[PDB]
Scaffold this active site. Structure first.
Site, mmCIF file in Angstrom:
data_model
loop_
_atom_site.group_PDB
_atom_site.id
_atom_site.type_symbol
_atom_site.label_atom_id
_atom_site.label_comp_id
_atom_site.label_asym_id
_atom_site.label_seq_id
_atom_site.Cartn_x
_atom_site.Cartn_y
_atom_site.Cartn_z
ATOM 1 N N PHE A 33 0.796 -1.230 0.000
ATOM 2 C CA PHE A 33 0.000 0.000 0.000
ATOM 3 C C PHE A 33 0.833 1.289 0.000
ATOM 4 O O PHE A 33 2.046 1.299 0.289
ATOM 5 C CB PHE A 33 -1.059 -0.055 1.112
ATOM 6 C CG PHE A 33 -0.493 0.238 2.474
ATOM 7 C CD1 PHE A 33 0.180 -0.749 3.199
ATOM 8 C CD2 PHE A 33 -0.570 1.515 2.994
ATOM 9 C CE1 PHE A 33 0.745 -0.469 4.431
ATOM 10 C CE2 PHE A 33 -0.001 1.792 4.236
ATOM 11 C CZ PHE A 33 0.647 0.805 4.963
ATOM 12 N N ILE A 155 9.677 -2.314 1.935
ATOM 13 C CA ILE A 155 8.426 -2.666 1.266
ATOM 14 C C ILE A 155 7.253 -2.274 2.172
ATOM 15 O O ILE A 155 7.083 -2.843 3.257
ATOM 16 C CB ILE A 155 8.371 -4.191 0.991
ATOM 17 C CG1 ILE A 155 9.509 -4.694 0.115
ATOM 18 C CG2 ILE A 155 7.035 -4.627 0.427
ATOM 19 C CD1 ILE A 155 9.861 -3.718 -0.987
ATOM 20 N N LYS A 156 6.387 -1.368 1.725
ATOM 21 C CA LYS A 156 5.278 -0.917 2.552
ATOM 22 C C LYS A 156 4.086 -1.865 2.357
ATOM 23 O O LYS A 156 3.249 -1.677 1.464
ATOM 24 C CB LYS A 156 4.893 0.519 2.227
ATOM 25 C CG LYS A 156 4.359 1.308 3.388
ATOM 26 C CD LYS A 156 3.591 2.522 2.881
ATOM 27 C CE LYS A 156 3.968 3.876 3.443
ATOM 28 N NZ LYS A 156 4.014 3.975 4.914
ATOM 29 N N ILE A 157 4.065 -2.926 3.176
ATOM 30 C CA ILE A 157 3.046 -3.961 3.080
ATOM 31 C C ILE A 157 2.383 -4.137 4.452
ATOM 32 O O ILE A 157 3.049 -4.041 5.473
ATOM 33 C CB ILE A 157 3.673 -5.275 2.572
ATOM 34 C CG1 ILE A 157 2.607 -6.292 2.196
ATOM 35 C CG2 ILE A 157 4.715 -5.881 3.504
ATOM 36 C CD1 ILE A 157 3.162 -7.557 1.625
#
Ligand SMILES: *Cc1c(COP(=O)(O)O)cnc(C)c1O
Ligand SMILES: *Cc1c(COP(=O)(O)O)cnc(C)c1O
Lengths: 305, 305
Positions: A33, A155-157
Site C-alpha cells: 500500500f 516494502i510498505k506492506i
C-alpha cells in the site's frame, strides 16, 4: 465515515469494502500500500494530491519483489484516486490508502503468492494535529527494527507493521507519543510510522536507506527542500541513540505524520526543549508546498476538481 | 468449497465470511490464529479433532502479548469448532483455522490495538499429500528468520508470515518443496511452515524454542511420543546448517505439514537418501495417534459426532 470507497475500478458504498477471510490480503496482511495525502486550499477552493507519482512509482517497484502482478496499470489507479476523491466530495484535507492486494489462493501451498490480484483506494477526511505545533515526546524502543534480509522495511506492506505496532503500543503504554527503534546494528532506524531526522552542528542529518527504514516520500521531499531552499544538503549517515540527546533538533516526517518536532527523548530535553528553527523553517516550506502556495513546486501537486 | 464458516458465535454461508478493509485484521493481518486438524476414522465412522486444548491454550497466551482481549472465552471457541465441523457435515480429514482478530479502530493512532475484537473458525476438507510417503527436497534459504525481539516467531499471527512467504516463494521458484532458514545467530531455526528435526548418532535432535521458531504442537507431540514410545528423549540444542548434510535423517512437522521426510538438502542426499527408520516409526505413531488407533493417547482427541 466517508460515503464511498473504490475497489477494482469502481466507487462502491463504504459499507461493502470487504475481503473474504481466506484472501491472502485479509489473512496475512498481504496488501502492498501507499499512504497519500490531499491538501485543501480554501483560498482557491481546490484539493491537491501531493506527489501521487512518487507514491505510484514506489508501489509498482515494490510489487516486483513480491512477485505481485498489478491488477490494472498504475495510470488506471491514478484515475481511481481521482474518482474516489470526487465521489466523496471532500472539501478538506484527506488521507488516502491505495492498495494492491493478493486475493484467493490459486495454489495448494498457502505461502506462495497468487495471480488473483486486486486494487482498492480508501480516503477519509483528516485535519492537522496540534502536536505539529507543540512537539511530541519519544522514547527509545525495547524492540529492534526488522531487517532487510528478513522482512524488508523498504516494502510498505500490511504485514510489515507488526514490528511498528509493538514499538508503538509500548510507547503509548509508557506515556510517550512514539518511540525510536534501533536496528540490528544498534543504530537509529526510524519510528513506528515516520522517518527521523536531527540537526547537529548546523546540519540536517538522517539515517541512510540501509538503516532498515522505509524510503519515505516525505523524507525525499524534505531532502530536496533543504538543499534547494536552505542550501543545506541533508547528510545521510548512521546515527547513534546518544546523538539524539545532544542534537540541536529532532523531528519526524511521513505522509500521515507530516512534520512532527520531537522535544523530549526518554524525558531528556532535545536542545533547549523548544521547537527548533530548522524544523519550523522546514514546516513552513512543507506546508507551503503541499497546500499549493509555492509556485516553484506546483508540479508536485495534482489538482482534483 | 465448504458450505459454511463460523464467525462471532454462529455458522454463516461461506460466501459472506468477510472483514472490512479498514479492520486491523484485513489491513495488517492482525489475526492471531491456530491451525487445527480433524482426522476421520472410516472404521468407526468418527471425526477426531487433535489436541484442540493445546491449540486454544496457545491462542489465549499469545493474545496477552498482543494486548488483545478475546471476544469470547476459549470454552465458547471450542463450542464453535464443534458447531462448524458439524454444520459442514465433514466425513474426511479437515484443516481448520481458528482466529482471534482485531476489528475496527477505536483510537486515532492506527498502530495501537483496538478493543473491538472477534473470532472466526474456517474449515476445509483436505487429504494426505503423497509427499508424506515419498520425502521432499529442501534448500537453505537466502532469507534470515525474523527475531524474537523484533517480530516474535513464537506468536502465530497472520502478519508474521511475510518472512515465511519470501523463503517459501524462493524455494519453489528454485525447484524445491521448501527451505530452511537460519536465524540471526547463523543457526537452524525452521522451515516456512513446519519445525525441523534430525537424527544424529541415534538421537532425535531439534533446535530449542530460542532459535526463533514457533513452539509447534506437533513438535511437542513428537517429543512426547519419542520419549514414551521409543525411549529416546529429543535433545533440544542449537543445530548448524552443515549438520544436515551428515545427519542420518531429517524431517519436518506441523499441523498442516504432518510429518514430512526430507531426503535432499541443496540436492545433497540426507543419509542414504531414503525415508529413515526413525521418521517412519514416528510417522506410524503419529498417524496412529491422530486417527484414534492407539487407546493410550485417546485423551488427545476430541470426537465430533
Ligand atoms: C509509510 C511509512 C513512513 C512515511 O513514508 P512516506 O513515503 O512519507 O509516506 C515512514 N515509516 C514507515 C515505517 C512507513 O510505513
Ligand atoms: C503453525 C506453524 C508450525 C506448526 O506448528 P503446530 O503448532 O504443529 O501447528 C511451524 N512453523 C511455523 C512458522 C508455523 O506458523
Amino acid at each position: 465515515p466517508p460515503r464511498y470507497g473504490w475497489m477494482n475500478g469502481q466507487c462502491i458504498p463504504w459499507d461493502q469494502c470487504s475481503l473474504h477471510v481466506s484472501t491472502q490480503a485479509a489473512f496475512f496482511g498481504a496488501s502492498l500500500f501507499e499512504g497519500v495525502r490531499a491538501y485543501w486550499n480554501a483560498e482557491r477552493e481546490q484539493l491537491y494530491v501531493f506527489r501521487l507519482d512518487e507514491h505510484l512509482r514506489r508501489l509498482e517497484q515494490s510489487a516486483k519483489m513480491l512477485r505481485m502482478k498489478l491488477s490494472m496499470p498504475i495510470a488506471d489507479i491514478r484515475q481511481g484516486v481521482l474518482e474516489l476523491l470526487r465521489a466523496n466530495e471532500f472539501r478538506s484535507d484527506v488521507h488516502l490508502y491505495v492498495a494492491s492486494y493478493f486475493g484467493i489462493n490459486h495454489d495448494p501451498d498457502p505461502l506462495f503468492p497468487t495471480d488473483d490480484t486486486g486494487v482498492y483506494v480508501t480516503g477519509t477526511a483528516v485535519s492537522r494535529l496540534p502536536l505539529v505545533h507543540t512537539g511530541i515526546s519519544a522514547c527509545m524502543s525495547s524492540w529492534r527494527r526488522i531487517s532487510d534480509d528478513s522482512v524488508p522495511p523498504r516494502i510498505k506492506i500490511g504485514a510489515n507493521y507488526q514490528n511498528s505496532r509493538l514499538a508503538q503500543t509500548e510507547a503509548r503504554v509508557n506515556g510517550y507519543h512514539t518511540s525510536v527503534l534501533l536496528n540490528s546494528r544498534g543504530k537509529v532506524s526510524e519510528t513506528p510510522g515516520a522517518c527521523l531526522l536531527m540537526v547537529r552542528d548546523g546540519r540536517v542529518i538522517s539515517p541512510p536507506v540501509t538503516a532498515d527504514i522505509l524510503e519515505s516520500v516525505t523524507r525525499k521531499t524534505l531532502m530536496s527542500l533543504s538543499e534547494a531552499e536552505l542550501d543545506s544538503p541533508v547528510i545521510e549517515r548512521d546515527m547513534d541513540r546518544t546523538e539524539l540527546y545532544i542534537a540541536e533538533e529532532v523531528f519526524l516526517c511521513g505522509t500521515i505524520a507530516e512534520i512532527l518536532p520531537v522535544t523530549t527523548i526518554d524525558r531528556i530535553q532535545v536542545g533547549d526543549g523548544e521547537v527548533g528553527p530548522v524544523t519550523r523553517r522546514l514546516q513552513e516550506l512543507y506546508f507551503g508546498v503541499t497546500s499549493g502556495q509555492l509556485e516553484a513546486y506546483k508540479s508536485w501537486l495534482l489538482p482534483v476538481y
